Amino acid sequence: DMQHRIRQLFQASIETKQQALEVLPPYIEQASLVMVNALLNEGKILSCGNGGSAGDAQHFSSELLNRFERERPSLPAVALTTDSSTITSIANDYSYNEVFSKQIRALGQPGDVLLAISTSGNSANVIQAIQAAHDREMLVVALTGRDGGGMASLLLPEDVEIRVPSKITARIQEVHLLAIHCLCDLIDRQLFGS
Amino acid sequence: GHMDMQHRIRQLFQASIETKQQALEVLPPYIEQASLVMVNALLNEGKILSCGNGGSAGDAQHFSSELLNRFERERPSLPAVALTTDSSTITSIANDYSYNEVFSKQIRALGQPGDVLLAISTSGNSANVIQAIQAAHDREMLVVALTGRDGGGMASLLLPEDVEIRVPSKITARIQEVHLLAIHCLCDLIDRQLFGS
Amino acid sequence: GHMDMQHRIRQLFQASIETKQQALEVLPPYIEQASLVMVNALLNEGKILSCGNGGSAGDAQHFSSELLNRFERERPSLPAVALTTDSSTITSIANDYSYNEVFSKQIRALGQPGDVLLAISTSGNSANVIQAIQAAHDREMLVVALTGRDGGGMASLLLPEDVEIRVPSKITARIQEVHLLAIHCLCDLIDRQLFGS
Amino acid sequence: DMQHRIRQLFQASIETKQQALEVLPPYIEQASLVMVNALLNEGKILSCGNGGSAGDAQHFSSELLNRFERERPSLPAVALTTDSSTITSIANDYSYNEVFSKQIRALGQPGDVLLAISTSGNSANVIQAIQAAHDREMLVVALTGRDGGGMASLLLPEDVEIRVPSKITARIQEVHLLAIHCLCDLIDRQLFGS
Numbered sequence: 001d002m003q004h005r006i007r008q009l010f011q012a013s014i015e016t017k018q019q020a021l022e023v024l025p026p027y028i029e030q031a032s033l034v035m036v037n038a039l040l041n042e043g044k045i046l047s048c049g050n051g052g053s054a055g056d057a058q059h060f061s062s063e064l065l066n067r068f069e070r071e072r073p074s075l076p077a078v079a080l081t082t083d084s085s086t087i088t089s090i091a092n093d094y095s096y097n098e099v100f101s102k103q104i105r106a107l108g109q110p111g112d113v114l115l116a117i118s119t120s121g122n123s124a125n126v127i128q129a130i131q132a133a134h135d136r137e138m139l140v141v142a143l144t145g146r147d148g149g150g151m152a153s154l155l156l157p158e159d160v161e162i163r164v165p166s167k168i169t170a171r172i173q174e175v176h177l178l179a180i181h182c183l184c185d186l187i188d189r190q191l192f193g194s
Numbered sequence: 195g196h197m198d199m200q201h202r203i204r205q206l207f208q209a210s211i212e213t214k215q216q217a218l219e220v221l222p223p224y225i226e227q228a229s230l231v232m233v234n235a236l237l238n239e240g241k242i243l244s245c246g247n248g249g250s251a252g253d254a255q256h257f258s259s260e261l262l263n264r265f266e267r268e269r270p271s272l273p274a275v276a277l278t279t280d281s282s283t284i285t286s287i288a289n290d291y292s293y294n295e296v297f298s299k300q301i302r303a304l305g306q307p308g309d310v311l312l313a314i315s316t317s318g319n320s321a322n323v324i325q326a327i328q329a330a331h332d333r334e335m336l337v338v339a340l341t342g343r344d345g346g347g348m349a350s351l352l353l354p355e356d357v358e359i360r361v362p363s364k365i366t367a368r369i370q371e372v373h374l375l376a377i378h379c380l381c382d383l384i385d386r387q388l389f390g391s
Numbered sequence: 392g393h394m395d396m397q398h399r400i401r402q403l404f405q406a407s408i409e410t411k412q413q414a415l416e417v418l419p420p421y422i423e424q425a426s427l428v429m430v431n432a433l434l435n436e437g438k439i440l441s442c443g444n445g446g447s448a449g450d451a452q453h454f455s456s457e458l459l460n461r462f463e464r465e466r467p468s469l470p471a472v473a474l475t476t477d478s479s480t481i482t483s484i485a486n487d488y489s490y491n492e493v494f495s496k497q498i499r500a501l502g503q504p505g506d507v508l509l510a511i512s513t514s515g516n517s518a519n520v521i522q523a524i525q526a527a528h529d530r531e532m533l534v535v536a537l538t539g540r541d542g543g544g545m546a547s548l549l550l551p552e553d554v555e556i557r558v559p560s561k562i563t564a565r566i567q568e569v570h571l572l573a574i575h576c577l578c579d580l581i582d583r584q585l586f587g588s
Numbered sequence: 589d590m591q592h593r594i595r596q597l598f599q600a601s602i603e604t605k606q607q608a609l610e611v612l613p614p615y616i617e618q619a620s621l622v623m624v625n626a627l628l629n630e631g632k633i634l635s636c637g638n639g640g641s642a643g644d645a646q647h648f649s650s651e652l653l654n655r656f657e658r659e660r661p662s663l664p665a666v667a668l669t670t671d672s673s674t675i676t677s678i679a680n681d682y683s684y685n686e687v688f689s690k691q692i693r694a695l696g697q698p699g700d701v702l703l704a705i706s707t708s709g710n711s712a713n714v715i716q717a718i719q720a721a722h723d724r725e726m727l728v729v730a731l732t733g734r735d736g737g738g739m740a741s742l743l744l745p746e747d748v749e750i751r752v753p754s755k756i757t758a759r760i761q762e763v764h765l766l767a768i769h770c771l772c773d774l775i776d777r778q779l780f781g782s
């Protein structure tokens with residue numbers, strides 16, 4: 001029974017990826033171009049998310065700040081989910097909704113990029129992070145799922161949404177991780193060739 | 195050299211120095227009781243969980259790292275865990291439920307009878323820490339509360355076996371400075387009591 | 392639309408999909424044994440410690456947060472602790488001694504007989520994780536190792552009661568993708584076994 | 589006996605502060621001006637350190653990104669000690685000595701400031717962080733103790749050292765924390781008046 005349940009999970013994950021391969025590629029490519037153009041212009045990338053998505057935020061920032069595959073220079077990315085003093089104080093002093101937006105308002109420079117990760121598209125703090133990136137004239141790459149939630153209504157024409165065609169948070173995170181490896185691979189290829 | 199700046203810095207140093215002098219007059223008894231609660235917990239194979247917000251979250255992990263690595267003398271690592279460092283845990287709990295549960299949910303899972311909670315707050319009024327204390331009580335843990343001002347809601351929740359180290363100040367930055375020194379004192383007393391000398 | 396980019400993305404998706412298909416053929420038995428080791432530890436009031444480097448450190452805290460908060464079903468928080476999140480602890484241990492001791496020193500302090508170590512490495516060759524396994528053994532803990540390639544030095548250290556989930560791939564990013572899914576499977580099996588349904 | 593030991597610690601801490609008040613103020617002021625000038629020119633501040641010093645690094649970044657005392661806008665600071673994926677991968681892949689320097693090379697922009705914290709002045713990774721800030725044309729504020737170690741030999745004329753007159757790490761960290769509150773207070777006063 002457990003073996004069957006595991007297979008069923010592997011299979012659902014495989015199917016979700018096959019469904020995502022049918023619609024995500026163009027958005028994944030557009031998002032990598034948005035990020036490469038920012039990196040080429042002294043810009044940096046900020047990432048935020050909650051739970052497994054906070055793990056994706058820092059997964060992305062480490063691939064860039066250290067490396068993805070080939071040896072190359074560190075690239076500028078900052079995860080907004082890791083400084084516990086900043087996060088706890090903001091949430092404590094005002095509200096949890098401001099933990100990312102408040103850092104973006106300080107760190108965001110025009111032309112920088114915000115990688116906003118949410119499987120529901122409905123996390124208040126990421127919705128507010130997107131508003132704050134817009135206030136700093138930043139472009140937004142949003143990794144989402146379901147119907148895109150409030151995050152999708154905030155996206156502007158230059159922003160890019162990568163909406164996983166799934167309603168299951170765990171499946172969604174699995175594609176998000178793959179999507180991030182694609183972005184890291186495409187950024188390296190674009191900046192340093194194949 | 196600029197007028198206001200050199201004056202201001204001197205004024206801040208003096209206020210930090212004076213605050214420690216007042217604290218020196220009332221905190222020693224509490225700092226000692228608190229180190230004994232911690233030492234007993236450690237001897238009984240228990241562990242210490244710490245929590246706080248902002249500068250206090252910095253203190254929570256400063257404490258944890260002093261024990262897990264070392265304070266001064268070379269000795270084995272001691273069991274402490276700061277409840278403020280796992281961003282996935284913290285963000286998912288706050289995002290799914292409420293920021294008020296970030297520490298308490300971890301304590302309910304991790305806390306064991308006889309463990310100790312180091313609850314840090316300069317006002318004594320942070321809801322998450324207040325809920326952490328209630329969770330430590332529900333897990334039959336003792337609480338060492340580092341506070342300031344009038345103790346706030348944290349103070350009224352403390353039980354007879356708990357220990358409060360209330361800094362005699364209303365200024366958060368002054369209270370944090372004294373909390374850091376108090377933590378260095380607890381680490382020092384814990385080594386003294388556990389390994390002697 | 393650009394030639395190479397759309398081709399490359401498709402190629403990466405396919406390689407991720409194929410890797411999962413190969414993993415689907417060999418990992419289920421191990422994933423199940425590993426969930427049973429974890430479930431037994433949790434039932435016996437033990438806890439799970441997780442560690443790893445880079446993407447694997449992300450996985451270590453993803454695992455910890457799934458248990459401390461929730462995976463899918465509403466249920467009480469479960470005891471897990473990622474050994475990779477406390478920066479004060481990690482930096483002081485690496486700075487004073489060696490980066491190789493960052494996990495092992497925490498395990499020696501925190502680990503208890505019957506606890507479980509989730510050791511994550513795509514090569515199986517990270518020294519700190521290798522030393523973490525040796526420390527879990529010294530604390531009479533069982534080890535669940537998420538690896539890849541040929542298992543590396545981590546594989547040769549495993550004992551008969553330990554469980555290895557070795558992804559059939561040599562590519563780190565592919566192995567991490569399968570490690571994430573494996574973790575979702577363990578969380579799913581842990582809830583199933585602990586609360587039924 | 590324990591009461592006496594505690595008093596002795598409080599007293600040693602008080603004395604160390606009194607000794608620091610005799611020599612630190614000019615450096616503390618110079619460091620706040622260096623930081624204010626960077627913030628006034630779209631620059632940001634990066635902080636790093638180990639152990640209690642990593643705690644100071646993020647203490648500083650939170651005071652700026654959230655707030656110190658008065659309500660004011662978030663200021664740009666990034667602690668390089670908090671993203672565990674970045675830190676572990678760099679140390680794992682190369683060596684622990686590169687955990688900060690590698691992030692500075694990516695994130696550092698000319699005119700930014702590095703707050704490098706070390707009670708000994710001799711931590712390899714902070715020594716290397718200072719070299720990397722110099723490569724990015726950044727100024728350095730170094731919080732140190734003892735004789736300044738390798739960090740002090742790397743400082744350039746525009747950099748500022750705040751060397752606590754103590755050899756005891758715990759005393760040194762106590763002054764560092766006070767020094768950081770001074771910097772936060774001076775930055776607020778300079779930027780938004782008294």
Ligand SMILES: O=P(O)(O)OC[C@@H](O)[C@H]1O[C@H](O)[C@@H](O)[C@@H](O)[C@@H]1O
Nearest residue numbers: 050051052118119120123169286289
């Ligand atoms: O993906 P979001 O809708 O932005 O929510 C993220 C987190 O709050 C977590 O929610 C649940 O607890 C789980 O699905 C987690 O895995 C998720 O990270």
Ligand SMILES: O=P(O)(O)OC[C@@H](O)[C@H]1O[C@H](O)[C@@H](O)[C@@H](O)[C@@H]1O
Nearest residue numbers: 089092247248249315316317320366
């Ligand atoms: O010390 P508490 O009252 O529990 O509050 C802690 C934090 O929310 C922070 O509040 C303000 O932002 C500042 O005073 C911080 O230094 C403090 O850590």
Ligand SMILES: O=P(O)(O)OC[C@@H](O)[C@H]1O[C@H](O)[C@@H](O)[C@@H](O)[C@@H]1O
Nearest residue numbers: 444445446512513514517563677680
């Ligand atoms: O998976 P390991 O062999 O134990 O190594 C983990 C990390 O050091 C990182 O190494 C490289 O930088 C990359 O492949 C990362 O994705 C990986 O986490």
Ligand SMILES: O=P(O)(O)OC[C@@H](O)[C@H]1O[C@H](O)[C@@H](O)[C@@H](O)[C@@H]1O
Nearest residue numbers: 483486638639640706707708711757
């Ligand atoms: O202050 P450093 O010389 O840069 O060293 C920092 C850390 O390695 C730690 O060293 C010892 O373990 C203790 O003194 C810690 O408090 C300190 O943070």
